[PDB]
């Protein structure tokens, strides 16, 4: 099956980003698309014979490469600003579809200067004793502020186990500063459950930042990729 | 313009139905209907070469000759949100896949006992931290928008607890402005 | 054979090994529409006129050629490795229009029953070769799954000269010259 | 040793579009082994070679192939053949000659399509005797030709006529000889 990497990357304008793809479906066709501001995926390169790349619709500024049958790399030699998007790898055999199987997306983000990259401040706001009393349900609200770039992932962990029932994170980051976004989310539990001091509530934001390959000065701490958290307990 | 997706985005409530048009410019060999979830992952719903198919609450059709393809959804649920894509195969210019411009599907909850409340929440690990959650309100009503600087407001995210019809709406707001109450910016609202 | 007003032959692909010899054409009513120059990757039409208005995208067939390189390998093995049987070609020389002395004409050389589709057709005037004015169509298909080519040659009707159409194949132990002259 | 594989996609149109049939032959060497027939409606092995293949192609490819008839045949005809190939009309090159009982070889060259009628006349009277003809000759450059003899003896003053009828001609062609 199709698996890409990096699954997310942040690059200076003027650098070489190299998205790889690898499939174990013995499919002869592979494709590389890109998804821009909600208006569809657009073909960039395909390839139906090892060591043969074929141009797509918007192949300008990219160079593909099909070494073996399982691998198909997309290459930007000079990362531009306009090349920020999410790149999907799909394969097939013979001629699409009904046997084309997509990748999982690769969020690429391109900045002019790496300095501006910064993790979030994850603060968990405890419920209102009004709601709990009047409505018998406690709402918690997780807020993640002051991060760059717009790529993080928020999740809720009641008692060490992830949860999806009664959660609602915000689909988009809300740019406040030139180089700062904000993103919220909230979880809701029956008041009775919120009162058990044995129950534990953790909100997790996962920043996607720099990697070992990336150069970082002596002063500030590196904005790497982290699981930043903030928690709270039950009470009466 | 090879492919044409319509509408560009639509609203709905539970149970209610709707369709999605896709008109093409030439004859396309096979079409394929997708749906990108909230995560960002593409999930194939249909692959058509001709005629029509049906899968549970979903049903689609394809006519190469008349250059179009539809997707009719019956009994809308929550999980049915997310954008929708039809791709079509070219055959003429290579056999590219040509995707449409997506159609953001929003499936509203249909609230029965709206208790439009607003609460202030506080960050136990930062004194001056104050935040305002506007909950339980009804699907229909439009959430106020922020126009000032330092004050920010989110759009109406919707949730659901497994208990019983626990679908609730709610937005959120905050500020680095002096200290201005939870009706001081929400005002166009109700109970507090 | 199936009877009808018209017959399309879209997609006609052909691949062979060794040598990676492939071909992709389109025919309509038995007249070659175009082929596709695999090395240049260009839709080479038979007649100019056609490929101006509406167009064909070379990739449509550069892909077929790829599927047929694959399919070949499959059958080659599945048939215990059964080679092809060379069949002998039958030449038929003739003028394109009423032969009048000293009037620019064209000498067609129609060759049939080919297989494998690998032929060396060359013209010959007065026992010495010719190279100017010689066009040559791709392998057009037969209902029996063999092929027929044609080699055209413009000339001026002279009763002094003798034309032969030299045909070289593997299903021939030695070349076959079909003699032609305006004398007779 | 040499090995070959072919594939022919044939589209038959009768009465224009009103009736279309689509065959498709996968052929090892010279031996056809698989085959889609729009009439039949599905893939059918035809030799022992493509015996289990038909199951596959039917499994994997049967759906799209069935529409290829309306998405490739229908389309090509209506949209690319009608305005180009069917549009092509060429006028012939009628030219009466004389053999090496003599013979009036009447050539009619370089035309398209192949629909034609080549009658002979003797002082305004039609002749069906002695008159030989050849099988429509396909030139390959999208033109045709045919030679229509007429064995006879020629009396001074007698008039002959090669009468040719073609779609490219509003008024039938006629060529005379004394």
């Amino acid at each position: 099956a199709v698996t890409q990497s990096p699954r997310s990357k942040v690059a200076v304008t003027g650098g070489k980003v190299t998205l790889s793809c690898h499939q174990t479906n013995n499919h002869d066709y592979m494709y590389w698309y890109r998804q821009d501001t909600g208006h569809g995926l657009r073909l960039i390169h395909y390839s139906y014979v090892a060591d043969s790349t074929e141009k797509g619709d918007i192949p300008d500024g990219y160079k593909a490469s099909r070494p073996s049958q399982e691998n198909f790399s997309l290459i930007l030699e000079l990362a531009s600003l306009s090349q920020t998007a999410v790149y999907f790898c799909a394969s097939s055999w013979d001629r699409a579809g009904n046997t084309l199987y997509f990748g999982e997306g690769s969020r690429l983000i391109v900045v002019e200067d790496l300095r501006n990259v910064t993790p979030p401040k994850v603060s968990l706001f405890e419920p209102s004793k009004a709601e709990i009393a009047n409505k018998q349900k406690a709402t918690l609200v997780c807020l993640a502020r002051g991060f760059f770039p717009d790529h993080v992932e928020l999740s809720w962990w009641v008692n060490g186990k992830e949860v999806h029932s009664g959660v609602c994170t915000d689909p988009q980051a809300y740019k406040e500063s030139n180089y700062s976004y904000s993103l919220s989310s909230r979880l809701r539990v029956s008041a009775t459950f919120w009162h058990n001091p044995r129950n534990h509530f953790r909100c997790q934001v996962q920043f996607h930042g720099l990697s070992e390959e990336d150069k970082w000065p002596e002063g500030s701490p590196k904005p790497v990729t982290q699981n930043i958290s903030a928690e709270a307990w039950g009470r009466a | 313009m090879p492919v044409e997706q319509n509408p560009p985005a639509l609203s709905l409530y539970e149970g209610a139905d709707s369709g999605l048009r896709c008109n093409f410019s030439t004859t396309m060999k096979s079409v394929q209907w997708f749906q990108q979830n909230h995560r960002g992952r593409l999930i194939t719903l249909f692959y058509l070469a001709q005629g029509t198919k049906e899968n549970g609450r979903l049903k689609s059709t394809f006519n190469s000759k008349e250059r179009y393809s539809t997707l009719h959804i019956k009994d809308a649920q929550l999980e049915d949100s997310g954008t929708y894509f039809c791709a079509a195969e070219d055959g003429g210019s290579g056999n590219k896949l040509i995707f449409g411009t997506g159609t953001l599907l929003s499936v509203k909850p249909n609230i029965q006992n709206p208790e439009p409340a607003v609460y202030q929440l506080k960050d136990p690990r930062s004194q001056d931290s104050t935040l305002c959650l506007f909950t339980d309100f009804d699907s229909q009503i439009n959430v106020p928008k922020t126009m000032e600087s330092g004050t920010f407001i989110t759009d109406k995210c919707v949730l659901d607890m497994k208990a019983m019809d626990s679908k609730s709406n709610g937005a959120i707001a905050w500020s680095n402005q002096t200290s201005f109450t939870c009706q001081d910016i929400f005002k166009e609202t109700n109970a507090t | 054979d199936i009877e009808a007003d018209h017959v399309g032959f879209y997609g006609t692909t052909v691949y062979q090994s060794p040598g990676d010899i492939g071909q992709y054409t389109h025919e309509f009513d038995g007249d070659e529409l175009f082929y596709v120059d695999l090395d240049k990757k260009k839709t080479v039409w038979r007649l100019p006129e056609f490929g101006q208005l509406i167009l064909f995208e070379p990739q449509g067939g550069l892909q077929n050629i790829a599927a047929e390189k694959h399919n070949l390998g499959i059958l080659t093995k599945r048939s215990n490795f059964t080679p092809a049987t060379n069949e002998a070609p039958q030449a038929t020389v003739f003028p394109k229009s009423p032969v009048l002395l000293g009037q620019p004409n064209t000498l067609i050389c129609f060759v049939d029953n080919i297989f494998p589709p690998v032929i060396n057709i060359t013209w010959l005037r007065n026992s010495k070769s010719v190279t100017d004015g010689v066009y040559e169509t791709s392998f057009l298909v037969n209902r029996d799954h063999s092929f027929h080519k044609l080699s055209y040659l413009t000339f001026i009707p002279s009763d002094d000269d003798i034309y032969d159409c030299k045909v070289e194949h593997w299903g021939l132990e030695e070349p076959v010259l079909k003699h032609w002259s305006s004398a007779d | 040793r040499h090995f070959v594989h072919q594939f022919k996609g044939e589209c038959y149109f009768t009465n224009g579009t009103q009736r279309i049939r689509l065959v498709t032959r996968y052929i090892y060497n010279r031996e056809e082994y698989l085959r889609f027939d729009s009439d039949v409606g599905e893939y059918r092995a035809v030799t022992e070679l493509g015996r289990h293949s038909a199951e596959y192609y039917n499994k994997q490819y049967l759906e799209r192939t069935r529409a290829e008839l309306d998405t490739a045949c229908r389309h090509n005809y209506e949209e690319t053949e009608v305005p180009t190939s069917l549009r092509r009309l060429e006028q012939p090159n009628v030219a009466i000659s004389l053999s090496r009982h003599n013979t009036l070889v009447c050539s009619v060259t370089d035309f398209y399509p192949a629909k034609i009628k080549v009658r002979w006349f003797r002082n305004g009277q039609e002749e069906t005797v002695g008159v030989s003809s050849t099988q429509l000759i396909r030139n390959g450059d999208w033109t045709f030709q045919v030679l229509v003899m007429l064995e006879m003896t020629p009396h001074q003053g007698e008039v002959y006529t090669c009468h040719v009828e073609h779609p490219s001609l509003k008024s039938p062609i006629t060529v005379e000889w004394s």
Partner: peptide, 17 residues
Amino acid sequence: GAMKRHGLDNYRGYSLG
């Protein structure tokens, strides 16, 4: 928007490797 020409596809048969 000039219509173009399509060309019947030939498919791969099961192989494995």
